[PDB]
Amino acid sequence: DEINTAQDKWHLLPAFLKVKGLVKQHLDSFNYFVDTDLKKIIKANQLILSDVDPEFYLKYVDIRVGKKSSSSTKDYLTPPHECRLRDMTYSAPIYVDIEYTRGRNIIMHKDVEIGRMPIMLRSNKCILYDADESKMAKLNECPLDPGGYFIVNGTEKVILVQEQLSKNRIIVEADEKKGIVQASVTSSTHERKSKTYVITKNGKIYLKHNSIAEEIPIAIVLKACGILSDLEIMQLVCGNDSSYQDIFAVNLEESSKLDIYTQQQALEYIGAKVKTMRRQKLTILQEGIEAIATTVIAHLTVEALDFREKALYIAMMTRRVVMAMYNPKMIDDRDYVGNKRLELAGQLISLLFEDLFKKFNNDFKLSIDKVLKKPNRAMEYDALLSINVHSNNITSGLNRAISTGNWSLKRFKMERAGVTHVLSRLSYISALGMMTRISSQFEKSRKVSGPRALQPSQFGMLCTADTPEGEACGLVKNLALMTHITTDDEEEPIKKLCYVLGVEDITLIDSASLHLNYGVYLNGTLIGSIRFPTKFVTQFRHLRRTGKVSEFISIYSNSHQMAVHIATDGGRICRPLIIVSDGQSRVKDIHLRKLLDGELDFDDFLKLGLVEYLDVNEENDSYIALYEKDIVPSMTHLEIEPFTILGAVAGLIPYPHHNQSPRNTYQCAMGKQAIGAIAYNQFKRIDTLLYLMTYPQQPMVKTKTIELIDYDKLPAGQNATVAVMSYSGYDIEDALVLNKSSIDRGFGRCETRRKTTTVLKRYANHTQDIIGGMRVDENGDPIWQHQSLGPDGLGEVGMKVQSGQIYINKSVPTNSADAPNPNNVNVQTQYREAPVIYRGPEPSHIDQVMMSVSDNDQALIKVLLRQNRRPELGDKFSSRHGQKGVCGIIVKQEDMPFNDQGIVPDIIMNPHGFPSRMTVGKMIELISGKAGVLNGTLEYGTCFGGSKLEDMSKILVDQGFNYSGKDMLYSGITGECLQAYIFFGPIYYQKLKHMVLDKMHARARGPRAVLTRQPTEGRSRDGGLRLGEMERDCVIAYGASQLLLERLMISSDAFEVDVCDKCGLMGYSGWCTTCKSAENIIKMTIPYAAKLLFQELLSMNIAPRLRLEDIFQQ
Template sequence: MAWPQITLTKILIAINTKKSFKFQGVNTLFSALSHEHASTRFDFTLVKSSQMSKSELVDPTYVEKVKEYVNKQPLVPAYLQYKGLVHQHLHSFNYFTSTDMQYILSANSLVSSDVDPHFYLRYTNIYVGEPTLDEEFISKKVTPQECRLRDATYSANIYVDVKYMRHRNVLVEKKGIVIGRLPIMLRSKNCVLYGKSDNELFKDHECPLDPGGYFIVRGVEKVILVQEQLSKNRILVDVDKKGEVCASVTSSTHERKSKTNVVVVKGKLYVKHNSFTEDMPIVVVMKALGVVSDKEIAMMVGHESQYLTTFGPSLEECSQLHIFTQNQALEYIGRRLKITKRLSKTYADEARDLLAGVVLAHVPVEGVNMLPKAIYFALMARRVIQALNKTVDIDDRDFVGNKRLELAGQLLSLLFEDLFKRFNSDLKKSMDKVLSKQNRAQDVDLVRLLQLQVDSITQGFSRAISTGTWSLKRFKMERAGITQVLSRLSFVSALGMMTRITSQFEKTRKVSGPRSLQPSQWGMLCPSDTPEGEACGLVKNLALLTHITTDIESEPIVKLVYVLGVEDILTVQAIHRPGNVLVFLNGLVVGITRREEEFIKDFRTMRRKGKINEFVSIYFHNQTNSIHISSDSGRVCRPCIIVENGVSKVTREHMKELENGILTFNDFVHQGLIEYLDVNEENDSYIAVYENEIIKETTHLEIEPFCVLGAVAGLIPFPHHNQSPRNTYQCAMGKQAMGSIAFNQLERFDTLLYLLQYPQQPMVKTKTIELIGYDQLPAGQNATVAVMSYSGYDIEDALIMNKSSLDRAFGRCIVLKKFGTNIRRYANGSFDRIVPTSKIDGKIPFKGAILDDDGIAAPGERILPGQIYVNKQMPVSLANETSFTPAPLSYKGAVPSYIDKVLLTSNGDSQETVKVLLRQTRRPEIGDKFSSRHGQKGVVGLIVPQVDVPFNDQGICPDIIMNPHGFPSRMTVGKMIELLAGKAGVLEGKLHYGTAFGGSKVEDVSKTLIEHGYSYSGKDYLTSGITGEPLQAYIFMGPVYYQKLKHMVMDKMHARSRGPRAVLTRQPTEGRSRDGGLRLGEMERDCLIGYGASMLLLERLMISSDAFEVHVCMKCGLLGMKGWCTGCSTGRHIVQMKIPYACKLLFQELQSMNIAPRLVLDDI
């Protein structure tokens, strides 16, 4: 049979026209060609040549197959509108105030007295009020802006309702008793800004774009960073430091936290716990838990020979110890416990209590039945044996599914629990003290006792958030660096800080595992936004659509699991019989099932119908043959579109209803169109990135691929065209760029504030820029950039600036610095005072020239270095109220400034404060740092008059000239495309998009340039401004968005000839702020020694540093004083010489340790 010849040209025509290509006839199918447009399907059906005419071969039939794809982008703003960028912080704090506080109160609701058993107090309710500020015994409502200005804490009262017994049988009920104050998170349900419209926020002097999610403590904005932890209550199999396999579980409940390990020592399994003095054989522990039969214990671990062989030595060891009953096992364990004070209990009772309450604290036991714990230990042993026999891999600690993120709510919950327990123990002591008094006639005033303890909770919260140190005595937990000051350098830096994740991992350890980019971080954590240096990979940022779960009640889930056909684990005889699949809920075994696929399918159906909370996840673990259900807090998850039978459930009609406001994002979740997947459930799913990649096995579809990036990395245009480290550099520099920080920026009194005078929104935007509001609060300007070499001042990334552009305020910024002082009141009633400056010979001296009649500088005045802006005086002694000493605040800056604003106020403690804001306007100068949005940073190398700058045929001059050597090694193609798209946008009057994995196409942009008479490549014909001749090459020129960074040469420049010295060593002080010297270090000293420059060494290290004249005795070689040697008791041999003061100090310190350094001197 002869086959017709199909030329490749015909096939390529079909591919290029994107049409389906069909030959009619008998079904002999060729495999479809694969190419980049996976959306185009080709079926080639050929027939025998006898049945096909020549004309059919020449003119094949084209059949159109057009599949329309749904634009899902509106789902992203809908999600952010429903959740917000910092929703996890707010959700967590709201959960703490509404639910967690109630749980903590219920667990500690009773306070009873040891002195009078009839007297007790019971808490019945707890709630948080609205933010207030106490002023002269009056409590008034307060806004966050007022707290910022007045250095007060934005906090609200915590109220409790109590019942207590007054007499033997009189029960008294009191409501609304204040037990302390809780700092309130901005934009949470307790905040005054919650649910307010933009206009109402303006009235409260707040910025509508400010995300909230932070606290204000003593006027300082503080963020509780998201903390990364290993997941609790889960078995993790790992290799310990000795290289042995070990299964560990960290139990965490409201009552107790402990760690239990199952380790292998010389082929036998042992249980390791802090309460045991030595490792306990696992069989002894299981017998102590009530499983006495060796056969039963072996069956709990596994029936197969691999388990029996490995577990055999452990069973033998138990029989060698002659332990056969539960009591013998308990006695054996009881004698090996770390208990300092033994009560009247027997060893067996001690061991029973410890096993029931402390070991595996998260596994619940009912009465004396400790079978659930025995099953759990058997599972741990089974996992260890599987890892030893290499049938199951050990767990990856860096896998995101094995991590939990702790938010502000959980951390405050831990802190409140500790403070509340301390509060109750102090209350109990006070009660016992009052009740133990003889002949107490009056009743105990419990309300007064409660109010006496108020400060302990208030100060506990304030201290923890101010210092960032969480010290919990109950759990022996000491963690530092939990909070940080909110960076207000730019709008993006504040936003980036709200999504930052930090871990308690030691930053100094050079380990690559925890730092590397894990595949499980896809869509959950931003791949680009991580700092450089020691924190690289340890500090991460959340992606755009990430959600962090809060605790979900597990009782209804357990009931549902049993309804769906799971057998209770306590009723099952042989747990590990073939076909049995274990079902776990939050790390606890709840039962077994034999129809795992149906169970998982039914469970997911129930979740999609809204019968179960949308954040509960379920997945099947292949290697351990088990089903895991999770409803705990701290899991990272993200929304994905559900795909069924190869079709996305979100249709064009749904998107229209969303755009018309009929549906919200929540409706998509409740209607089963979108569901949240955590990292573990993602492993069970088959997710398509684009709709045209959906195949039969696909279960989910990404909402938008650009959502894998975070809020900061999302600002980069065309990031998918850049080398990846460049995007990481931009994430760091984007936070240092000056711009607008908020709509209320001019009403703030920040310590240091950088503002760009004329910020512009970029010509090339991304979808993220619109979503986070960066286009309303930008940090940069569109500069016309020419890529060419111009003089030698542009090497090493230096930029050449056009002087006329700087005259027209390109890169001009305002620097605002706050200075202030407190008017202190002293115990004897005296206080500091501010007085006007006094005239000398009828004239006001230079230092006080700008002071007003009240002794404070007037707003708008120009202040010169050395001038006073607050003329303060302090009492000389507290005894005498009449004499005062001057303590003025004078300006120490190098260049003149202007008094921008003056604020006179008092904080919450009624302490008066004076704040003065100084303003400088700076234009770019040589040495100032600039950067594009592609990690291309450089300093200004030269400022050139416009007449010398090249110009194109329209007379347009570049604002910045950049050296072309910045491109080849950096490979920032995104910057080139940005220049092209920006140029096309300027010509046609529209903004282009450079969103990741999308955005404007180079072909379309080039077409626009050609239509407007420009080269498709973006190159222009330029004429030299110096010679007037055409340049010898076409120059790549167009607009690029440039950021001015905070690093300015004026703030770095430092030199000194003489100045202050350290008291101890008499050497120059260190640091620019203290007018210190420039350190000549050990390496520099070695260089000078190497060159043999002895006089230069002498000059640098002694004459210009700490030369000191000493008297030395030539006879004994020791230091004398005032021409007298105390050792020789004579002054005849004393000579004078100069040595460094630090050297003299060393000699004296050695002498104090009984080491006598003697100088051997000769006459020269």
């Protein structure tokens, strides 16, 4: 069997994804953190000595997590799932080593805990890492759990991969008015800093830099950066000839009216407008006063020592803005992916860690001193063991951070909020749905038109099938199935290599540059402007694919602008695909048999120089094919598979290429809200609100992208025999109609699971809160409002509870919270019993009730309740395909369409959805379904592929069915033939969240807020609903007075006020109290919000004093 070059491309991706897991993004960055950066952070500060006793020092040397130099991995740890029950945090301890100084000639050292890092599941350091299917069982946890999510305080959450604007690169924004601001916001460690640069008026262009004061003419700074000839500046920043002559000439002009020869003036004129030096180290107020700032303000990008590099840099940045001033367009738009870099969980931790650590020292220099103030004998005694005293600023400070998600960074003086989100298990898809989700940010307001829509440059490197409604501050996206997020590589080696290949250093480059070839930029910095752009590139790219400079460090030509960028920056989006070199592809079909034979795998191609990750810009500079059927000798790359364009969730849609997009977007949005198997540990785990389905089923048609994510071993949905027919009237608009004697046969039956945790916690009074109970009046039975409990006084297993019952009886001590004293003759006794009750619309059951204790040693009780919801009227069902709906009438059995083989279509759907949704991919999924089930093979279909439709029919017709699904049906409510045919075959309907029995909500008169008194918000609390400023107008338009007054007055807050006619003000009962009367006052009624405004006003100094008049006699 010769392997088929057209198809067998497909066998790449699983091996790709088998080796390098689906989520490396959270995994690998976290590994690279715990291994590399931790070693680097202390390598930055290994020395702390406060100023006293010149002989002392504390030298950090090693960092490790969970290895004290005993065993390979940790000698002791806590199983993660077990940690998920106790509300603990899953952690491995930090270990350090410090050569230090205590006494005479000593310099001792050790291995010490400074605290506990909360390591991530399925990392390098987790217990789960490489455990096989059995150790999985002993650790009582799911094999299929994606992993890559932390767990703290018993919940888990996640570090949501957080997209960020390009940092330390060039950006140019044009605009109406203005004059085209440019910006480079550049940060390395110390001092994030922005430099904005723009025209002020009429060709006159300045640096606005909040570091410096304001507005330096570009010719001045350009001088002070070392290019003094000033009439070659035109050759540099302007160009050779062009039109830039006059356009730029204005700023070069009035540079003359002020100064010249920067060695004094311009260098000084800079330092004249600087801010203060912050007192000390002002001594360098000089002519070189500001030369520091010229060298370093934000430009730690370049900085360095002589002035030419930075000079020509700022120059080539000035060129592009005057180019924009010549014509619009010709400007980088802040939009497309190429200028966006995303930063995984590894770095986002590091920036928090090295802060908390820097604090740990900054206070530890203090706690080292209160020893050294008072010369108590000879003071040594290591001073060390106080570090444990001083710790958990690193641990607890880190826990509280990762749980809450408010990152306080004073080092960059910038505080982000809302990073983490609770990992949401409603299903198996959502479990990786909070993974592979990119949180967009920055980009100022909500309506701003620039950073919103979806750009075509996004092909295959970000999911095109969903970009949902979750905006808030910024839009949310998803990665593809294949994205390898660029890590950092290195800088100097690729540099001096670029010299080796024949560039020439910026110094020797003279005058004309923009003339010669294009130029070459390294991370957005000019170096060599090599001759012969083409051969340079092709050579270089040939190295990237073989022996050096691997993965990223990509390269691409640019025509319009003359340059060739070379970027090594990390945190950048990539994707694999196959090279077609010269004539045709590099695969040659022999490597694939050389592959699935079992000895090739992936990352082996990269050494072989076959496939390589691309870069957004780079693929722009490439030419790419799709199907091997298209290769032209002019081509460069071919994608390995087309359907990798759709994201993780998007894979569930069969035949996405037969729909329009909005049905996929609504799908990819909702599918993660379906109900499913969760994980194999499903029953052993107790989570806050967890759904799950009784009898799940594989989706009949599989998109090949399911098998990769193992959705078929955890299917969410039912596979339901459906017929598209308008039926009863209850069908109509989107509304499904189900089937009794069918739903009763175990269709879509839901189990729900909740828990209420109650931590029994002792009080400073040496007093414990107790679980006793079980009153049992009148000889032998517990009272009903209690009953149902047990001898233990705690909820018991498997007993129906509803409404007033008590499923955990919690008594608290009364006087405990008071101030205890060294006096108790007898009683700690008296208890206030505050049992928690199960208030619910339907009876339910208690199954598994846990007693445990957290790390701080306090009783902890967690019980979980289950009720199995029958898919009652008013439930959301969805068709996998973009449909949505709610059951209408539930027909019995005998009614509803039937037929030749008497099958009674289970769900009976509606036709009218199809035309104006225009989704035919479903109506293909049907035929594929009836097809597959009759042969017995699950019949694949997949994005841009799958089982062709035209050979389906030949599977049916021979087996006795119409070549389309349309087949006669006998209306069961009559028994005649349906005068038109009906079209049906099994579709896959996945029952969703938003069960009605939750949502149905009603109120007579409920609680009131102490504050306003209006009805309190939402369900839970209680009920009551909302007439908004928007809606109230409605009843005005009708002109209904007594209704409105009957609504916004009597029904909501009906309130009496006693006002004094004279000097109108409010008073209680009899008195006016501004004038003692109890005489001139008249009672009347008024909305309580209105009174509340008369006080909240009248408190603030103002008084609407009420006049009055009687109603009658005109």
